[PDB]
Scaffold this motif. Structure first.
Motif, PDB file in Angstrom:
ATOM      1  N   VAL A  33       0.850  -1.177   0.000  1.00  0.00           N
ATOM      2  CA  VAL A  33       0.000   0.000   0.000  1.00  0.00           C
ATOM      3  C   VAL A  33       0.889   1.231   0.000  1.00  0.00           C
ATOM      4  O   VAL A  33       2.084   1.172   0.310  1.00  0.00           O
ATOM      5  CB  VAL A  33      -0.969   0.034   1.203  1.00  0.00           C
ATOM      6  N   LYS A  34       0.288   2.351  -0.384  1.00  0.00           N
ATOM      7  CA  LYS A  34       0.950   3.651  -0.402  1.00  0.00           C
ATOM      8  C   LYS A  34       0.341   4.494   0.710  1.00  0.00           C
ATOM      9  O   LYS A  34      -0.874   4.710   0.731  1.00  0.00           O
ATOM     10  CB  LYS A  34       0.764   4.325  -1.762  1.00  0.00           C
ATOM     11  N   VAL A  35       1.174   4.951   1.638  1.00  0.00           N
ATOM     12  CA  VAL A  35       0.712   5.713   2.790  1.00  0.00           C
ATOM     13  C   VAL A  35       1.059   7.173   2.554  1.00  0.00           C
ATOM     14  O   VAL A  35       2.210   7.494   2.233  1.00  0.00           O
ATOM     15  CB  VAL A  35       1.347   5.190   4.090  1.00  0.00           C
ATOM     16  N   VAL A  36       0.067   8.057   2.687  1.00  0.00           N
ATOM     17  CA  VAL A  36       0.288   9.486   2.508  1.00  0.00           C
ATOM     18  C   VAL A  36      -0.316  10.242   3.681  1.00  0.00           C
ATOM     19  O   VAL A  36      -1.293   9.803   4.301  1.00  0.00           O
ATOM     20  CB  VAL A  36      -0.299  10.013   1.181  1.00  0.00           C
ATOM     21  N   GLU A  37       0.290  11.388   3.989  1.00  0.00           N
ATOM     22  CA  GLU A  37      -0.253  12.282   4.997  1.00  0.00           C
ATOM     23  C   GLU A  37      -1.496  12.981   4.467  1.00  0.00           C
ATOM     24  O   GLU A  37      -1.624  13.242   3.268  1.00  0.00           O
ATOM     25  CB  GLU A  37       0.786  13.337   5.402  1.00  0.00           C
ATOM     26  N   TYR A  38      -2.404  13.305   5.383  1.00  0.00           N
ATOM     27  CA  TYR A  38      -3.615  14.032   5.021  1.00  0.00           C
ATOM     28  C   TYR A  38      -3.258  15.318   4.290  1.00  0.00           C
ATOM     29  O   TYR A  38      -2.374  16.066   4.723  1.00  0.00           O
ATOM     30  CB  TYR A  38      -4.419  14.350   6.285  1.00  0.00           C
ATOM     31  N   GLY A  39      -3.949  15.571   3.181  1.00  0.00           N
ATOM     32  CA  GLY A  39      -3.755  16.791   2.427  1.00  0.00           C
ATOM     33  C   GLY A  39      -2.684  16.729   1.361  1.00  0.00           C
ATOM     34  O   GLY A  39      -2.504  17.717   0.630  1.00  0.00           O
ATOM     35  N   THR A  40      -1.981  15.608   1.237  1.00  0.00           N
ATOM     36  CA  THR A  40      -0.953  15.480   0.209  1.00  0.00           C
ATOM     37  C   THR A  40      -1.567  15.642  -1.174  1.00  0.00           C
ATOM     38  O   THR A  40      -2.596  15.038  -1.486  1.00  0.00           O
ATOM     39  CB  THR A  40      -0.261  14.123   0.327  1.00  0.00           C
ATOM     40  N   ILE A  41      -0.949  16.466  -2.013  1.00  0.00           N
ATOM     41  CA  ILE A  41      -1.414  16.616  -3.387  1.00  0.00           C
ATOM     42  C   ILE A  41      -0.618  15.665  -4.272  1.00  0.00           C
ATOM     43  O   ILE A  41       0.606  15.790  -4.385  1.00  0.00           O
ATOM     44  CB  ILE A  41      -1.277  18.068  -3.864  1.00  0.00           C
ATOM     45  N   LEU A  42      -1.311  14.703  -4.891  1.00  0.00           N
ATOM     46  CA  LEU A  42      -0.675  13.699  -5.730  1.00  0.00           C
ATOM     47  C   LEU A  42      -0.955  13.980  -7.200  1.00  0.00           C
ATOM     48  O   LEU A  42      -2.081  14.323  -7.570  1.00  0.00           O
ATOM     49  CB  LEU A  42      -1.180  12.286  -5.385  1.00  0.00           C
ATOM     50  N   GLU A  43       0.075  13.838  -8.029  1.00  0.00           N
ATOM     51  CA  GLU A  43      -0.107  13.614  -9.456  1.00  0.00           C
ATOM     52  C   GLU A  43       0.251  12.161  -9.727  1.00  0.00           C
ATOM     53  O   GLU A  43       1.397  11.743  -9.504  1.00  0.00           O
ATOM     54  CB  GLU A  43       0.751  14.549 -10.309  1.00  0.00           C
ATOM     55  N   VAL A  44      -0.729  11.394 -10.184  1.00  0.00           N
ATOM     56  CA  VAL A  44      -0.556   9.986 -10.506  1.00  0.00           C
ATOM     57  C   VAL A  44      -0.612   9.853 -12.017  1.00  0.00           C
ATOM     58  O   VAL A  44      -1.609  10.227 -12.639  1.00  0.00           O
ATOM     59  CB  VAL A  44      -1.639   9.123  -9.843  1.00  0.00           C
ATOM     60  N   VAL A  45       0.453   9.322 -12.612  1.00  0.00           N
ATOM     61  CA  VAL A  45       0.506   9.116 -14.049  1.00  0.00           C
ATOM     62  C   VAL A  45       0.425   7.620 -14.295  1.00  0.00           C
ATOM     63  O   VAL A  45       1.327   6.878 -13.890  1.00  0.00           O
ATOM     64  CB  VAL A  45       1.775   9.702 -14.670  1.00  0.00           C
ATOM     65  N   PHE A  46      -0.672   7.194 -14.918  1.00  0.00           N
ATOM     66  CA  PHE A  46      -0.870   5.802 -15.312  1.00  0.00           C
ATOM     67  C   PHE A  46      -0.198   5.566 -16.650  1.00  0.00           C
ATOM     68  O   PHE A  46      -0.477   6.276 -17.620  1.00  0.00           O
ATOM     69  CB  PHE A  46      -2.359   5.480 -15.435  1.00  0.00           C
ATOM     70  N   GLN A  47       0.666   4.559 -16.716  1.00  0.00           N
ATOM     71  CA  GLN A  47       1.390   4.244 -17.942  1.00  0.00           C
ATOM     72  C   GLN A  47       1.069   2.814 -18.363  1.00  0.00           C
ATOM     73  O   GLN A  47       1.534   1.869 -17.725  1.00  0.00           O
ATOM     74  CB  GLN A  47       2.892   4.424 -17.723  1.00  0.00           C
ATOM     75  N   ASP A  48       0.295   2.656 -19.431  1.00  0.00           N
ATOM     76  CA  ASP A  48       0.100   1.323 -19.991  1.00  0.00           C
ATOM     77  C   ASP A  48       1.427   0.797 -20.525  1.00  0.00           C
ATOM     78  O   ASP A  48       2.257   1.565 -21.022  1.00  0.00           O
ATOM     79  CB  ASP A  48      -0.934   1.356 -21.113  1.00  0.00           C
ATOM     80  N   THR A  49       1.646  -0.512 -20.384  1.00  0.00           N
ATOM     81  CA  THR A  49       2.753  -1.169 -21.064  1.00  0.00           C
ATOM     82  C   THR A  49       2.203  -2.057 -22.167  1.00  0.00           C
ATOM     83  O   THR A  49       1.009  -2.356 -22.224  1.00  0.00           O
ATOM     84  CB  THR A  49       3.608  -2.013 -20.113  1.00  0.00           C
ATOM     85  N   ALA A  50       3.092  -2.463 -23.063  1.00  0.00           N
ATOM     86  CA  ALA A  50       2.707  -3.341 -24.154  1.00  0.00           C
ATOM     87  C   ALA A  50       2.865  -4.813 -23.798  1.00  0.00           C
ATOM     88  O   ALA A  50       2.684  -5.664 -24.673  1.00  0.00           O
ATOM     89  CB  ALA A  50       3.526  -3.011 -25.407  1.00  0.00           C
ATOM     90  N   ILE A  51       3.204  -5.124 -22.544  1.00  0.00           N
ATOM     91  CA  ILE A  51       3.399  -6.512 -22.127  1.00  0.00           C
ATOM     92  C   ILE A  51       2.101  -7.272 -22.338  1.00  0.00           C
ATOM     93  O   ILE A  51       1.054  -6.891 -21.803  1.00  0.00           O
ATOM     94  CB  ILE A  51       3.855  -6.586 -20.665  1.00  0.00           C
ATOM     95  N   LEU A  52       2.162  -8.340 -23.145  1.00  0.00           N
ATOM     96  CA  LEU A  52       1.023  -9.200 -23.470  1.00  0.00           C
ATOM     97  C   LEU A  52      -0.104  -8.437 -24.155  1.00  0.00           C
ATOM     98  O   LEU A  52      -1.257  -8.885 -24.149  1.00  0.00           O
ATOM     99  CB  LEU A  52       0.508  -9.935 -22.227  1.00  0.00           C
ATOM    100  N   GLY A  53       0.213  -7.300 -24.769  1.00  0.00           N
ATOM    101  CA  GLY A  53      -0.761  -6.545 -25.531  1.00  0.00           C
ATOM    102  C   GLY A  53      -1.114  -5.205 -24.915  1.00  0.00           C
ATOM    103  O   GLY A  53      -1.587  -5.144 -23.773  1.00  0.00           O
ATOM    104  N   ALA A  54      -0.866  -4.125 -25.661  1.00  0.00           N
ATOM    105  CA  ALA A  54      -1.377  -2.814 -25.279  1.00  0.00           C
ATOM    106  C   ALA A  54      -2.890  -2.871 -25.159  1.00  0.00           C
ATOM    107  O   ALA A  54      -3.575  -3.530 -25.950  1.00  0.00           O
ATOM    108  CB  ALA A  54      -0.970  -1.747 -26.301  1.00  0.00           C
ATOM    109  N   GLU A  55      -3.414  -2.182 -24.152  1.00  0.00           N
ATOM    110  CA  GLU A  55      -4.826  -2.295 -23.836  1.00  0.00           C
ATOM    111  C   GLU A  55      -5.221  -1.063 -23.034  1.00  0.00           C
ATOM    112  O   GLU A  55      -4.435  -0.586 -22.208  1.00  0.00           O
ATOM    113  CB  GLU A  55      -5.082  -3.593 -23.044  1.00  0.00           C
ATOM    114  N   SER A  56      -6.418  -0.544 -23.288  1.00  0.00           N
ATOM    115  CA  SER A  56      -6.933   0.559 -22.483  1.00  0.00           C
ATOM    116  C   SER A  56      -7.499   0.018 -21.174  1.00  0.00           C
ATOM    117  O   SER A  56      -8.369  -0.860 -21.182  1.00  0.00           O
ATOM    118  CB  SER A  56      -8.013   1.339 -23.239  1.00  0.00           C
TER     119      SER A  56
END
Ligand SMILES: *[C@@H]1O[C@H](CO)[C@@H](O[C@@H]2O[C@H](CO)[C@@H](O)[C@H](O)[C@H]2NC(C)=O)[C@H](O)[C@H]1NC(C)=O
Ligand SMILES: *[C@@H]1O[C@H](CO)[C@@H](O[C@@H]2O[C@H](CO)[C@@H](O)[C@H](O)[C@H]2NC(C)=O)[C@H](O)[C@H]1NC(C)=O
Ligand SMILES: COc1cc(/C=C/CO)cc(OC)c1O
Ligand SMILES: *[C@@H]1O[C@H](CO)[C@@H](O)[C@H](O)[C@H]1NC(C)=O
Ligand SMILES: *[C@@H]1O[C@H](CO)[C@@H](O)[C@H](O)[C@H]1NC(C)=O
Ligand SMILES: *[C@@H]1O[C@H](CO)[C@@H](O)[C@H](O)[C@H]1NC(C)=O
Ligand SMILES: *[C@@H]1O[C@H](CO)[C@@H](O)[C@H](O)[C@H]1NC(C)=O
Ligand SMILES: *[C@@H]1O[C@H](CO)[C@@H](O)[C@H](O)[C@H]1NC(C)=O
Ligand SMILES: [Cu+2]
Ligand SMILES: [Cu+2]
Ligand SMILES: [Cu+2]
Ligand SMILES: [Cu+2]
Length: 547
Positions: free
Chosen positions: A424-447
């Motif tokens: 799990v990812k533990v963050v302090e209250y109020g932390t502003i996160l930028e989360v970048v989701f990166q698809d990989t092509a492993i076993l097929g690129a897919e949305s």
């Protein structure tokens, strides 16, 4: 503001096949929860069915209240057969369409229904009040018990069998066997406007959706108003809801058809793997029209081809939050912490003395930053609350452990493998996160439709290929990005989102394709208590299910 949801064993027939399913109050799909903005709704859940189950209120923040959030072994252990549990649903910022569904195994295949959150008293829609409103739930049907579909894939390690039909409000429609008599139908009057509340409650595919002869003005998604735009078709991914206005102005004097097909069909690009590519249909019928006008078949819409990535991209590109004085926006501008999260379908070695059916006769799996999530047997939230060691590890990484050309097609077979864990990812209250989701092509690129419990988030950017942390942020939408709880990550691409972690609790994040959820495309944010009573997680309710 109070509901009794009895989980029932219910006999249901579709495609001429009868089976007993789990349903709520004997209804498939289940009942709609109706609320107004900022309501608190109580749902007493009585499990009178044959298996462990939980319910989740999808897209409801549940501020300080993970206890009523539902994901099995994340915020609770299951409601056992014969047991009950009272959920408290705390609505706050949400206004529009959400939905609810089982959050245990594949139970949501049949255990799901709509949530409608109307403007609170003294407020109105930002658009003219529709004459009528209609939930439109897209889903799947298997003839086999869905429990058996899941168990078989667990045993073989191979892919999950495709569904036998796509459905609208539980009904396959006109072009499936034993289905034409009970196709979902809705009546329209000439000149009136209708609010379609579309929910993708399927388990497997993003869907294109359209109504013959009628344009759709999209006005909201995931409980948040959008900058209106009018289209011929939409794309909607499992987990998402989309609200749109339909204007019924076709001629009712007999000069035009009086029946029009509503239709949906998958968006799917993996030409190697099987898919339930069957369309599903429902009928919009002008009732005040002459009987001669319904003589032939209903008109059919043009749907994009199943592999039409351009059509998918073109719809998703139009999503923008509505920003007005009545509906303001709060895009986080200064990020405290950046995450890059690679999303992959994977294999793990077949167990000893067994033959598996996945790629290379390995076992299928899935991962975020190359950790394949494994459910604990003590739910995360209880372990967090009681400080129970040996349940989870609080070191889910902010970056993938090995950088490579993520979206380069056909990566070498060594890159297929992953490793299980409960991180799990533990963050302090109020932390502003930028989360970048990166698809990989492993076993097929897919949305992948990535979904975060406990929060909505601003989707500030998206693109194809490998996210470039030094160039792609320069064209982020920091003004009116869409505010979603489930984001379609591009096929072979990336999506960037921002949110303030200001909801103390234990919050699941996962792909909303159920097969990827069970294969481990998941993690958990633990948001620590802040300062002040308003930043404190609620105490544990007295009658939580035992682990
Ligand atoms: C994801 O993790 C797996 C498992 O740890 C990695 O596969 C291992 O790779 C090392 C070499 O780097 C081998 O010595 C191990 O035998 C592999 N384990 C297997 C095949 O089960 C994999 O490289 C990682 N993939 C990433 C980071 O993209
Ligand atoms: C239904 O849920 C209960 C609660 O999680 C499960 O019962 C637990 O099973 C574990 C084994 O993994 C035991 O260590 C616990 O002592 C059990 N707790 C109880 C009985 O309160 C039960 O196994 C689940 N049923 C199925 C079919 O998965
Ligand atoms: C692109 O990832 C997938 C690979 C595979 C490969 C399966 C080969 O056994 C299956 C899937 O389920 C539909 C996937 O989502
Ligand atoms: C629900 O479960 C509780 C135990 O947590 C039990 O005491 C109660 O009688 C059950 N039935 C209800 C509330 O109708
Ligand atoms: C899954 O599909 C295969 C056909 O490809 C069939 O042999 C098998 O019986 C199906 N599994 C279940 C549980 O129905
Ligand atoms: C749905 O599929 C059937 C069978 O392929 C086809 O005949 C029908 O035209 C399709 N309907 C629409 C609206 O595309
Ligand atoms: C189980 O697997 C081991 C390792 O490959 C093998 O030596 C053994 O013969 C197997 N057991 C059987 C075939 O009963
Ligand atoms: C990454 O892979 C893509 C797709 O094959 C390719 O076009 C690109 O040149 C590669 N980038 C690097 C740095 O090798
Ligand atoms: Cu959901
Ligand atoms: Cu959710
Ligand atoms: Cu979830
Ligand atoms: Cu996925």
């Amino acid at each position: 503001t109070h509901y009794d949801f009895v989980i029932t064993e219910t006999k249901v027939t579709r495609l001429c096949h009868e089976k007993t399913i789990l349903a709520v109050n004997g209804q498939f799909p289940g009942p709609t929860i109706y609320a107004r903005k900022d309501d608190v709704v109580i749902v007493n859940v009585y499990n009178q069915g044959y298996k462990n189950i939980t319910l989740h209120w999808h897209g409801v923040d549940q501020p300080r209240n993970p206890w009523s959030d539902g994901p099995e072994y994340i915020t609770q252990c299951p409601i056992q057969p014969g047991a009950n549990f009272t959920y408290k649903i705390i609505f706050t910022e949400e206004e529009g369409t959400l939905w609810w569904h089982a959050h245990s195994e594949f139970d949501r295949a049949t255990v799901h229904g709509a949530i409608v959150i109307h403007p609170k008293r003294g407020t109105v829609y930002p658009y003219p009040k529709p004459h009528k409103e209609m939930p439109i739930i897209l889903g799947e049907w298997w003839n086999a018990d869905v429990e058996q579909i899941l168990l078989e894939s667990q045993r073989t390690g191979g892919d999950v069998n495709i569904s036998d039909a796509n459905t609208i409000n539980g009904q396959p429609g006109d072009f499936a066997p034993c289905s034409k008599e009970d196709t979902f139908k809705m009546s329209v009057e000439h000149g009136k406007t209708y609010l379609l509340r579309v929910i993708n409650a399927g388990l497997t595919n993003e869907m294109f959706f359209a109504v013959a002869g009628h344009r759709l003005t999209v006005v909201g998604t995931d409980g948040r108003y959008l900058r209106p735009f009018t289209v011929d078709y939409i794309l909607i991914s499992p987990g998402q809801t989309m609200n749109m206005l339909l204007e019924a102005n076709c001629a009712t004097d007999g000069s035009a058809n009086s029946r029009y097909y509503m239709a949906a069909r998958p968006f799917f690009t993996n030409t190697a793997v099987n898919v339930d590519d069957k369309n599903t249909t429902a009928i919009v019928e002008y009732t005040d029209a002459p009987p001669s006008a319904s003589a032939g078949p209903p008109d059919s819409p043009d749907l994009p081809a199943m592999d039409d990535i351009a059509a998918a991209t073109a719809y998703t590109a139009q999503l923008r939050s509505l920003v007005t004085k009545e509906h303001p926006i709060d895009v986080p501008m200064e990020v405290d912490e950046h995450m890059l999260v690679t999303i992959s379908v994977n294999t793990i070695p077949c167990e000893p003395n067994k033959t598996c059916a996945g790629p290379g006769n390995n076992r299928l799996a899935a991962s975020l930053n190359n950790v394949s999530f494994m459910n604990p047997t003590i739910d995360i939230l209880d372990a967090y609350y009681d400080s129970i060691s040996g349940v989870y590890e609080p070191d889910f990484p902010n970056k993938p452990p090995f950088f490579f050309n993520f979206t380069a097609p056909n990566p070498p077979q060594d890159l297929w493998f992953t490793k299980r864990g409960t991180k799990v990812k533990v963050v302090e209250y109020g932390t502003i996160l930028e989360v970048v989701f990166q698809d990989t092509a492993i076993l097929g690129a897919e949305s992948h439709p990535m979904h975060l419990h406990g929060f909505s988030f601003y989707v500030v950017g998206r693109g194809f290929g490998n996210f470039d942390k030094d160039k792609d942020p320069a064209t982020y939408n920091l003004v009116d990005p869409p505010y979603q709880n489930t984001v379609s990550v591009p096929t072979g691409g990336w999506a960037a989102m921002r949110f303030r972690a200001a909801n103390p609790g234990v919050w699941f994040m996962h792909c909303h394709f159920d097969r990827h959820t069970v294969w481990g495309m998941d993690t958990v944010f633990i948001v620590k208590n802040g300062k002040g009573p308003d930043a404190q997680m609620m105490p544990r309710p007295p009658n939580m299910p035992k682990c």
